[PDB]
Symmetry: C3
Subunit: 315 residues, 3 copies
């Protein structure tokens, strides 16, 4: 059993969670509402560099597999559940782009338009091609989160009009996913094993949509508030449904679940700036504290379970 | 056959219809657009007291059954069609709360926040628990109307922010219900017998949503108008589809159908205040006249059929 | 085989495409953004008269069949796929009404209210009756486009309030159609033959809705922009999915596909007026050029294939 076979596409899950952490701490240092913490922006410098190293190493190793064992890649593509992970490498690169650590880049009004085109295009072509396969042969193949994220990148460039077009496309696909998935949610028992990639974008897409609305227009309306509150209601359902009595075991799939929690925390900070008050401030800090704590303990657990015991990679 | 067995949970239907009548006549006396009628506010005083008596008597008798024959209550819970009626006792109490007869309460800016918490919480816990049962074992178990009604109560207290959160949650559940129920509407023949509790909230939830929007913001927009017009279009479909040639017979289920009609009438009065004109005024009065007439004739019929013949309660 | 049997209801398809062309060229002559072309309004005079001749001839011949062979009409009604075409004669008359060639009518603020009632009523009665048949015996029987078109006619009369009511009804039916049709789109192979009437209103209803919003309110908002962008995204999917390598053959069904393209072009012109700029202007002209070119080449092809070879009408 060579190492290439035991290396699946699920490795990209860890990069998405860690990269999403970078945007959270950037806000905590550039938030006028949360100025009283005096958080040093140097934290983002370490986190952003760490996200680049893991993304390059993961991507480079996977490229070697694609030339060495193309047939293995071909087999993975067809399987229905693990298809969504093909979108993961493209969407994560956009997350680093919006971070854009202040120290590296001298102050400028907008980023160069060339950056948007290179990252965005491979995603749009993949979205249409993967959608066509479903018709030839649920509706879980559709990608929703990436379109909302691209709108944020487009707003940073300054192309306001195209950002509105991407938001409309992302919303339309959400309706089909929302109706089907809500009817049959996964059972509390054996939650991580079943439909783990698909579920993550169910508690995350609304929170991303609210952030995109704030960048395009600049003022909160019913779109940003209601989408944010829907995500909060869905997030609360996890606590009530999860069984505290039932035991839990370590699994690689836990890395993907981190990403939904982080996106909600960033969205809450936007709400606090628009509407000041003691309620919002405490709620924003609480969500951030839970998100960052889970990553730190999970990072230690996934580090020990891979080195001394080499149980991270199954046969 | 003891009286406890022949006493079902459908008795709560009559309370919902009569309690909804109270809010209608309160508006008719406090509407600047309909000032020319000079309606005495004393009508609400009689109606509100009458609603309290029936609600207490119905609730007190049912509590006796729950301790005497718990297993009978347990059997009723599982059956799919008659599950929605468990939400009915909680939602109706909120309807009396908004009425708040002026004579009883000295003029005050807002009501005490404690009233909102006691009534609302048992409903939110019930909504999550009942929804979980569906996943373990359509989508008719979901409750939609109560969330919109709670927003009205929250606005009366003055907690504007939480009212927006409840409205978002209620809207999201409506999408699943609207798609499924619209595909298979009940046939005109044997209309009352089939799916009678579920259908009532289909012509009623839009009208409640429009009222909630007016209280939170204060100015009509596309939300209030389009939701109100959707309810009107759905209400008109009943007249066209119902068969006049086919005969009708007395049934206990008719009490639930009163509640949808009353809610639409109250919503129309809001429209008349925002947009004045002869068209709206006549339409508002016509809907109220039909609603109040149906209750009076139905009340007499349900009174005679229960006393001289004792045919109200089946075996 | 008498000519009456070989004359189907699909003949009304050609009238819808040609009549829709009339509104496009009217805008091109009355558009301040596209003033630099100096397009003579005389083009609409020829087109509008040509649309009236074909509509009268098609309608008059079909009336003869309805009295001669009523049973044949009765058989056609039941078949599920070819039911939507019954709505086509009524909706097309509204399209000529909005055109209202300037030369014929002296300048006036609004049109007489009587015109709206005569055309609209037969459509509303048909919508309710056809919808009832589905319940007694997908959800493709529902009509969506006509309600949005009627709102435009109502706005021309000046009855603003009723136009909002029609828009709400049309939107509600769209949700059921959008969810069902999007799940199972037709395959690229043998595209014209399968579900040809139903598909045409899928790329067309959003574009009609955006135009109606602009007339009722007068200022673009998120309704007009997002609905327009959804239609653009759906239109682009046709180019990617269609197979260029696969050959194509002449068919009568191609006339219906013209109508979706024209409606999108008219909607784009509205966008250019609201938001000026070089991007929008070129995109508006390009869509119009493709639409008008397709009609001209198709008109020649459908003319030659019917006269020398008499292959237009199948047995
Ligand atoms: C794909 C995800 C990100 C969104 C899924 C949710 C949408 C299907 C629905 C939920 C409720 C709907 C909203 C209902 C109420 C409003 C407020 C409505 O009225 C306003 O104009 C708000 C601002 C104001 O004028 O005060 C604007 C659109 C919006 C947000 C609606 C847009 C579509 C929403 C967000
Ligand atoms: C759960 C029930 C109560 C609502 C179900 C209906 C909604 C799914 C849809 C129907 C049409 C949609 C509306 C379409 C048009 C508008 C107007 C739109 O534009 C405006 O800003 C209106 C006010 C103005 O700016 O003039 C605001 C949101 C809204 C109401 C939309 C919100 C979501 C609505 C109400
Ligand atoms: C039946 C067809 C014609 C429409 C099908 C699409 C609708 C189901 C959804 C898609 C996204 C929704 C929209 C989402 C965002 C908005 C913007 C929202 O916010 C605004 O107030 C826009 C204007 C502004 O205030 O800047 C108003 C309603 C609207 C258009 C929503 C109404 C309902 C929409 C159009
Ligand atoms: Cl940001
Ligand atoms: Cl996705
Ligand atoms: Cl009220
Ligand atoms: Cl309910
Ligand atoms: Cl026009
Ligand atoms: Cl249609």
């Amino acid at each position: 059993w060579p190492f290439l076979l035991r290396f699946p596409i699920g490795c990209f899950g860890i990069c998405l969670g860690l990269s999403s952490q970078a945007v959270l701490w950037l806000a905590l240092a550039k938030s006028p509402a949360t100025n009283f913490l005096h958080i040093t922006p140097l934290i983002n410098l370490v986190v952003w560099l760490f996200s680049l190293v893991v993304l390059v190493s993961v991507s480079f190793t996977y490229i070697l597999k694609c030339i060495f064992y193309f047939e293995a890649v071909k087999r993975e593509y067809f399987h229905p559940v693990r298809v969504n992970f093909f979108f993961a490498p493209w969407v994560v690169c956009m997350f680093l782009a919006i971070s854009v650590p202040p120290m590296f880049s001298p102050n400028r009004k907008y980023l160069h338009p060339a950056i948007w085109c290179v990252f965005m295009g491979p995603y749009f072509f993949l979205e249409l091609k993967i959608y066509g396969q479903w018709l030839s042969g649920p509706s879980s193949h559709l990608s929703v989160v990436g379109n909302f994220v691209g709108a944020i990148l487009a707003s940073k460039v300054g192309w306001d009009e195209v950002a509105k077009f991407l938001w409309a496309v992302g919303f339309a696909h959400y309706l089909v996913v929302f109706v089907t998935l809500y009817q049959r949610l996964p059972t509390s028992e054996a939650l991580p094993k079943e439909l783990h990639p698909v579920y993550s974008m169910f508690i995350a897409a609304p929170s991303a949509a609210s952030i995109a609305w704030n960048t395009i227009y600049g003022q909160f309306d019913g779109c940003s508030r209601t989408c944010f509150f829907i995500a909060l209601f869905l997030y609360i359902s996890l606590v009530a449904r999860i069984n505290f009595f039932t035991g839990f075991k370590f699994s690689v799939a836990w890395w993907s679940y981190t990403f939904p929690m982080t996106t909600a925390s960033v969205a809450t900070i936007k709400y606090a700036e628009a509407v000041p008050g003691y309620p919002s401030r405490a709620l924003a800090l609480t969500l951030s504290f839970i998100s960052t704590a889970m990553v730190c303990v999970l990072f230690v657990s996934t580090l020990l379970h891979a080195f001394v015991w080499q149980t991270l990679f199954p046969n």
